[PDB]
Amino acid sequence: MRWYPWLRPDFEKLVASYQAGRGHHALLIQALPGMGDDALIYALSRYLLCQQPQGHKSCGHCRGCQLMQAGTHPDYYTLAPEKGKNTLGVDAVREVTEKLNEHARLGGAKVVWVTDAALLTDAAANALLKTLEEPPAETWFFLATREPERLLATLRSRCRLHYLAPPPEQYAVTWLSREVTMSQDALLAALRLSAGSPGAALALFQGDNWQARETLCQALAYSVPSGDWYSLLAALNHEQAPARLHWLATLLMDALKRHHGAAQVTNVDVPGLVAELANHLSPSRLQAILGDVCHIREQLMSVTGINRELLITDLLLRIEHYLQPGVVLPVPHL
Amino acid sequence: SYQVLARKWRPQTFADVVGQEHVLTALANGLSLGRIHHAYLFSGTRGVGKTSIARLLAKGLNCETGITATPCGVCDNCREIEQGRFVDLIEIDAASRTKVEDTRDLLDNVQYAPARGRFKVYLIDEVHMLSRHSFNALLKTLEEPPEHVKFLLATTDPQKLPVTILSRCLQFHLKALDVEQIRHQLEHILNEEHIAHEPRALQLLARAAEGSLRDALSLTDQAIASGDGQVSTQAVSAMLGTLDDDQALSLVEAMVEANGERVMALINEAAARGIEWEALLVEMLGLLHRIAMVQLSPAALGNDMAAIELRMRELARTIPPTDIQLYYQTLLIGRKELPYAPDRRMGVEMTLLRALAFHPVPLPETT
Amino acid sequence: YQVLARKWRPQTFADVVGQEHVLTALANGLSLGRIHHAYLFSGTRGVGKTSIARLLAKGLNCETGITATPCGVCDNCREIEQGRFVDLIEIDAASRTKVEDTRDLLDNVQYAPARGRFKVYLIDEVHMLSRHSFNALLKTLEEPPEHVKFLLATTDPQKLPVTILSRCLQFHLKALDVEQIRHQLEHILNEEHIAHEPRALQLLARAAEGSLRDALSLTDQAIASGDGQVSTQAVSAMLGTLDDDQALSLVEAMVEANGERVMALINEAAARGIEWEALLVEMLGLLHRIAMVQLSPAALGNDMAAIELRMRELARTIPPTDIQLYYQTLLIGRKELPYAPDRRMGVEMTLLRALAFHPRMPLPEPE
Amino acid sequence: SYQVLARKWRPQTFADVVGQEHVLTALANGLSLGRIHHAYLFSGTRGVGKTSIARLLAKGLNCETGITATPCGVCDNCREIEQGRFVDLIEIDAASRTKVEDTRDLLDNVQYAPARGRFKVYLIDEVHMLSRHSFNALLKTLEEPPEHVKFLLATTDPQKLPVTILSRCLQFHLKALDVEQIRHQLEHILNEEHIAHEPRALQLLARAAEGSLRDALSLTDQAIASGDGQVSTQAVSAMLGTLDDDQALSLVEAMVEANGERVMALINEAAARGIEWEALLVEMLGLLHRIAMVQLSPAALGNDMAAIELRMRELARTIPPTDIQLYYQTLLIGRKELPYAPDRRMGVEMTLLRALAFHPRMPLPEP
Amino acid sequence: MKFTVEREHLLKPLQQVSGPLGGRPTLPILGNLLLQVADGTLSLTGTDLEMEMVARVALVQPHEPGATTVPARKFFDICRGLPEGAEIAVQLEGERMLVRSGRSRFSLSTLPAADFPNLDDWQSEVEFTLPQATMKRLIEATQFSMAHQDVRYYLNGMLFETEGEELRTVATDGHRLAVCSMPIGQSLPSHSVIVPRKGVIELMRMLDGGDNPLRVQIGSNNIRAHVGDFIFTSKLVDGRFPDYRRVLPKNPDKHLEAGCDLLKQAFARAAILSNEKFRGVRLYVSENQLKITANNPEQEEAEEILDVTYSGAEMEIGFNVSYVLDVLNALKCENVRMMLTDSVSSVQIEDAASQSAAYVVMPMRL
DNA sequence: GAGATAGTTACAACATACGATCG
DNA sequence: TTTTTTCGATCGTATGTTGTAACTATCTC
Ligand SMILES: Nc1ncnc2c1ncn2[C@@H]1O[C@H](COP(=O)(O)OP(=O)(O)O)[C@@H](O)[C@H]1O
Ligand SMILES: Nc1ncnc2c1ncn2[C@@H]1O[C@H](COP(=O)(O)OP(=O)(O)O)[C@@H](O)[C@H]1O
Ligand SMILES: Nc1ncnc2c1ncn2[C@@H]1O[C@H](COP(=O)(O)OP(=O)(O)O)[C@@H](O)[C@H]1O
Ligand code: ALF
Ligand code: ALF
Ligand code: ALF
C-alpha cells in the first residue's frame, strides 16, 4: 500500500467535502487494480478518525492516530474475505451491522471499509442495503471496485460514485522508467496489458510473471506453425490462469488488428510473434479462438471450485479442432 | 446534522409523492370506504418509493384523528413514526432476519393488543430474501390474522415469493417515473434548496436516471459535490462523459464502409481522450435506429439532427435494412457483454472487429 | 370490513364450487358408514382444501349424528364455524415442525374426546414436517385409537415419504374452470350489492388462473380502485392490459407489410402511454393463438369471441412458416429489449426488423 | 363401522400370508429343527408384511403347545398376542422414542426373567431412526444376549444401520407382491366382504398397487367409497384418471405418433392439476434421453423405472433414433426459450407443436 | 516492574478483571490485560472493545513503577494453581516477564502498553453518588421486564432518567412496562440515557450490598460506575426510547384492591392447568368478586374464586399469567392495587401502600 | 421448636458434532 | 506395491458442560 503521486488531486477534493460537513455517507470508488484506491480510502479514514486534525493531514500523535498506527482502534470496522477463502460472507456483514447500533467508544466517527465490493455474495449485498440507506449518525462507508456494473442496482443506487482516471501514458511510462529498468517497448507492453494503470505493471515486473509471459510466448511461437496447441497446457495450468488467458487474448487481438491493418498494438515487444500468428491463421479463426478464450476465462473466474486442468484441456482440444477445414465456427448470440 | 438529499427529502404526505396515481387512489378509496385489507404487497423497480408508500400508509392507519387518507403529520403518532421510534410499528429487515426462529418469535407476539396505537403494523422490507420455512410459517397467520394487526410487504423481486403468499395479498405495482416527472421533482428540490441549475443539466440527469428517483438524487448530489456547489451543464456533461461531438457518426460511417485502419485510429484517439464506452455504444445504437427509421420514411428524421442530416441520408440510401439490423444487433450484443470483457476497450475493439466482418510526494498519512 | 375471502368460506357441501368427485366420495363414505382414519388432500393453492377439511370435520362431529349434510346450527357446528371447537385440534405444521412437538402431540392421543364423538386432528402444511416427525407418525396412522381421525392438507404431496402416502386415502383437487370462477364472483357480488359488468368478471376470471382466492383478492382490489363498483375500465387499468383490438390491428398491419400504418399506430400507442412489454407479450399471445387455431379449429375459446371471426381470417391465409418467423422475431426482440437504449426504440427496431425480413413484401433494396 | 379393510385383514396364520415363500419356509424349517438365531432383521419395501410376519413369528415362538411354525391360535398366549397386550411381547416404536435414555431403560429391562413365556421377545420397528448412542447401547446388549431373550427388527432402509449391528443378525429381505398375487388377494377379500366387483377393475387396482398390498387395499377402499358400496370399471377408471400423474410419458407417446387433439387434451388435463411446466418439460427431456440410451443398449433401462418399462421399451423398439434425436433437440430449444415466452403454458404448447409438425433448418456449414 | 504480593489479596481482583474476557480474544492485544504499577498501587484493566473493567489494589511492599500487558489466561492459571498462602513475585526482564510462582519460574510474553485501547480522558455529562441498596432495588425491580432479543434495538436495554432530584428506571419489551423511581437528595438536570442489557447485568452482579456508596458518571457516549476500588465502563445504545407516560393508561376508573399473598396463591394454583405454550388465563370481575379461569389443550379446566373490594361494572379480560406472577413477585407488598378501564385496554398494577413503582400489562386479545 | 446457612438436585442456556436440502 | 470431493447459506437432532435458583436437611439459637 504505497501512495502514488497521481492520487494527490482527487484526495484534495474528497477531504474538502468532509471539511464542510457535507460529505456523503457511502462513497464508492471505481479504479483499476494497482491504481491505489486503498491508499486513498486509508488516508480518508485516518483523517476522519483523527481527534484534532490540522489542514488535510492527521496530527499523528492523538489517541486515534496512535491506535490507528497500532491497528487496534475500537472503531474502524473492516470487512475482508477469510484468509483461506475469497468471498465475504453474510455473517461478517450482519455482525458489523449489529455492532454499529451502539455509540462510538471514542466519541468520534465510525468508519466501515469494504475491501472489495465485487466479492460480496448476494445475501451480504442484500443485507447491507438497509444499513447503507439510513446509517446512524457519524457513520461513514467506503467501497472499492473495478466494475460497478457487476454490483446490484439497488446497492449501486445508494452510493455516491467517484472515478479515478489513469494518468497520461507518457507520464506513466516516465514514472515506470524512474522506478524499474527495462526496455521502452517492454514498459509500453506492460502498461498496455494493465489497461494503462501504473503500479500494476510494476507489480508484474517485480514478480516472475514476466518469465512466465516469455515462456508462453515461446511456446505459442513453437506451437503455431505445428498446429498442436495442446502443448500450451503446460504453460497455462497454473493458479494465475486468468492472467495468462488474458495475455493470449491480447496476442490474438493484436494479430487480428495487424491483419486488418493498424498502427497501434498492445504487444509492442514481440512484432515477430504477432506477425507469424497473423500469417498462419485466418481472421475468422482468430476471432473464434479469441471468443472461446474470453468465455473460458470468464467461466474460470466466475464459477467456484471448477477444475482448471479439464477446462483448459477441453479449450485447447476445441482450438485444435476448429483449425480443421469444413468445421462450423461458433457465433456470438444472446 | 447534515443529511443527503436522498433521505432528507423523503415524502411525508400523500401530496408529496410523484406519480403512482393509481396506487394512491386505490389506497384513498379503501381508507374512505372502510374496506381495509390485512396484506399489502408493493412491487416494482427500485428507487420508486415502496418503503415511503408503506410508511405513509402505516402513519395514516395509526393517526390520532382516525383512519384517514391524509395524515395530519403533527399529532404524536405521526411524528413518532417519522422519528422511527413508534412502538407499534415493527420494521423488519428481512434481508438480515431470514432465520425461522426470528419469524416464529415474531408470530408468537401477534396475539397481544397494541401498546398505544389502534393497529399493530408489521412492515417487512425486502421480503423476497426470507427462506422457504419463513414463508411457510408466515402463510398460516397471514391468511387470517387477528383484527388488530396489519401486514405490509415491500419487495423488488416478486418472482421469488411463492404463489401461495401472492394468492393472499393485495398487489400494487409501482411504475417507473417518467423523465418529465423526474426533471420536475429535481428542479423543485433544487429551488427549495437554493441551488443554481440549468435546464440542460436537469434534462441530462433525468435521462440518465433510467426511471429511478433515488438514482437521480444520487447523481444530483454527486454533481453538486464535484460541481463546486453548482449544477452546471458543463460539469454534468464532464461527469457523465457525454460524447457531444459527432464521434459516433464518424465511427459508424467507418464501420459501415469497412475501413479497419480508420476505425482503429478513431478508437485509439477516443481512448486517449478518455471517454465512456457505454455512452458511445448507446449513441451508435441510437444513430443506427434513426437511420433505419428514416429508411422507413424520409420524413422520419428529427429536426435536431439537421446539422448532420445530409450524411445520414446517404447511409439510408446506400445500406440495405438487413445490414442495419445486423449492425444494430451486433452492437447490442457487444453492449450486453461489455462488463464481462477483461477490459472495456478490449470489448469495444472486439465488437467492432466482429462488425467489420459484415461486408459483401506530499503523503498525508499512508504508508 | 371483513375481507371477502374470510367472509365467504363455504359452510356446507352445497356452497363449494366444483370438486364434484371428492364431495361425492366423502358423501358416499359418510352415508354408507365406511369411514377411514387418515385423509390427505392435494392440489394447487386456493382451491378449497382446508375448507372441505373443516366441512368434513363438522360433519363427523355434528350432534344429529354422522351425516353428509350437517345441520350447521347445532352447538358443535357453530363452534367449528367460529373456530373454537375443543375436539378439532388444528395444527400448523409449518410453525411447529420439530420432532419433540410431534412426540408431545402423540403422547396424549389416548384420552377420550371432551364432548364430541371423534377427536379430529387437522394438520396443515404437512410437507414442512421434518423427516423424524414423518417417521414418528407411522404407527399412529396405521393403528390409531377408534376415537381419533387424522386429516392432512398439503400443496406438494410428492414431498412426503411413500410410507405415509400408503397409509391414508388421497384426494386431489383440480383447478377451477373460468366459467365456475366467473359464476362464483357474480353470485358473491350480487349478494354484496356491488355494481359489475360481464367484461370485468371475464377479465378477473381469466387473470385468476384457477385459484378462487386469487379471484376474490383481485375482485376486492378492483372494488377498492373502482370506488365501490366494478367497471371494465377499472379492471383494465388495474391489470394494465390493453384491449385485444389494438394488438390485433397492429399484428394485421405488420402482416400486410404497411410500414406507415404500423408507425402511426405505434405513435398513437405511445401517446396513450401504454407499456411496451405488455404490448409485445400481447402480440406474442395473439400469434400463439393463431398458430394453435391453425393446429385445430377448437383451440380458440369464447374469450376471444369479440374478435374471433377476424382472427380466424388470419388462420386461413398466413402460411405456418410466416407465423413461426413472426413469433420467433418477436420473441428475440423481447429477449434483447432490456439492453436497448430505450423501450420505444427497442420495439420500433423489432418491428422494423420484422418488416425488413417479410417473406412476401420485403423493404426495397438500394441501387 | 366395518373397521378398516387393511387393518381388519391382517394375516393371523402362516397360511394366510400371500407370497414371500422363501422367508416363511426358512422360518418354519428353523423353528421345526430348533435352529433359532439370536436376532432377525426383516427388510423390504413398504406394505409387504414385515410387521405381520414379525408378529406371526413372535406368536409362534411362545405358544403354549410348543415352539412350532403353526401356532394353535386358541391358547392364552396366542390370543393375548393377537390382542396386542401380551406381557412378554415388548413392542417398541423406535421412531417415537430414539433418545439414548429410552433405549437404555428398555435394554436394562432384559435382566429379568420372562413372566409367563419361554422367551421374552423384543419387536423393534423402524430401527433406522435410532440415535448413534442408542445403536451403541443396542450393540452392547446384543453382543452376548441371554438365552431367553430374542430380538426382532423391522426396517425399510437397512443401509442406515451400522455394519456391526447387521453382522449380529440374520437378514430376511422381502420382494414385491407381483400383480397376480395382489389381484387374487383382493378377489378373496371382496368375496369375503360380499361386495360386487368386476375383473377389469381388480386388474387395474393391482396394476396401480405397484407391489404394495397396503396401497392396493387403500385404493380398493377408496374405490368402494366412490362406487357407492361396489367396485365398477368406470368408477375405478375415473378414480385412477384423477390420481394419474404420468402426463409426461403420455404426452411423449402422443407426440411421437403425430396426434394433435390428444396432445391438447393431455395439456388441458395437466393444466387442471397444479403442475410446474418446466418440471414437465425436463421430465419429457429425461424420458427421451432414456429412450435413446435404451435404443443404444437394452441394459440402459434399470430396475427403478419398472412401472413404465413396457411402454418405454416398445417406444425404443419402434421409433427410429433420428426422430428421437430431433425431438430431443427441439424440446431442448423450447426449454432454452421458455422463460421469454409470453406464458409458460403457451410456450409449452408452442414447443409441443414445433416438435409435432415442424422441422428446424440447421445452419449447414456453407464455407 | 518488580513487585511481590501475597496470593490472597491478588486473588479475586484478577478474577473480576478476567471476567469480561472470553475464550476467543480475536486480537492479540485484547487477549492480554494491562497492569500498571504507579505510586503505591497496582491497576489491572481488561477490555473487550465494549466494556472495560479496572481494579486497583494498594501495594505497601517495595515496587518499581511501570506499565505493561500480560496474558490473562496464563496469569489466572498461575495464580489459581499455587497453594494457599503462597507469595507471588513478578519482574519484567526485558521482553519477557518472569513470575516466581512459589518455587516454579514461569515466563510470559509482554506487549507494548501504548497499543492497549483503553479510555484516557473522561468527560462526565452528569455525576453523582448513591448507596448501593437503591441501585440494587431499582435494577431488580426493573430488569425482569427488559427485552432479550428483538428487532427494535432500542428496547433491548434499560432507560435511566435523572429528573429534577430523583432517578427513574424504565424497562419494557412491547408487552409489559416497568417503571421505578427514587430520590437521591441531589439536584440534577433532566437527562435520559439507555444502557444495554449486558451492562445492566454486569452492574447488578457488581453490587454486593456493601455499605460503601456507588458513584455514577454519565458522559456523551459512555457510563462509568465506581464501587470500592473497582470501575466498570460501558457504552450506550444511542437509539432513542419512547416516553413511558403515553404508555400508561389515561384516567383509569375501575380499581381492585386485594391481598398480594392471596392473589399470588390463586394465580400459582390456576397456572397448573394453564396452557404451557401461552400460559393464558381469564379474569371475570364483578362486585367484590374475582373469578380466575384457566384452560388446557386437552380440556382441563381450573377455577378460582377470590373476594376483593370492587365497585365497578362487570368485566372479562384475558391475561398472561407469567407476567402477572413476575409483577407480583417483584412488587413485594402486602396489598395490590390494579387499575383498569375496559376489556381491551392496558392494565396498571402497583401497591396501595405507595406509588414509587408501577407496572403495566397489555391484555392478550383472543 | 423455629430460623438461617450450606449442600445437592433440577432446569435453562451455550457449545460441538453430524446429517440433509436447495441455490 | 494404490489411487479418489464444489461451496454458501439454512434447518434439525442428540449429547456434553457450566451456571443460577429453589428445595431439603442439619446445626445453633
Ligand atoms: N414517488 C416519489 N416521490 C418523491 N421521492 C421519491 C419517490 N420515490 C422515491 N423517492 C426518493 O427515493 C428515496 C428512497 O426511496 P425508497 O423508500 O428506497 O423507495 P424503494 O423502497 O422503492 O427503493 C427517498 O428518500 C425519496 O426521496
Ligand atoms: N370449492 C370452493 N368453493 C368455494 N370457495 C372456495 C373453494 N375453494 C376455495 N375457495 C375460496 O378460497 C379461499 C381460501 O381457501 P383455502 O381454505 O385457503 O383453501 P386452501 O386450503 O386450498 O388454500 C376461501 O376464501 C374460499 O372462499
Ligand atoms: N403378504 C401379505 N398378505 C396379506 N396382507 C398383507 C401382506 N403384506 C402386507 N399386508 C397388509 O399390510 C398391512 C400391514 O403392513 P406391513 O406390511 O406389516 O407394514 P411394513 O411391511 O411396511 O412394516 C396389513 O393391513 C396387511 O393386510
Ligand atoms: F429501498 Al428500495 F428498491 F425498496 F431501494
Ligand atoms: F391454505 Al392453502 F393451499 F393456501 F390450503
Ligand atoms: F408398516 Al411399514 F414401512 F409401512 F413397516
Ligand SMILES: [Mg+2]
Ligand atoms: Mg425501500
Ligand SMILES: [Mg+2]
Ligand atoms: Mg388451507
Ligand SMILES: [Mg+2]
Ligand atoms: Mg409395518
Ligand SMILES: [Zn+2]
Ligand atoms: Zn491525530
Ligand SMILES: [Zn+2]
Ligand atoms: Zn396524525
Ligand SMILES: [Zn+2]
Ligand atoms: Zn350440527
Ligand SMILES: [Zn+2]
Ligand atoms: Zn397357542
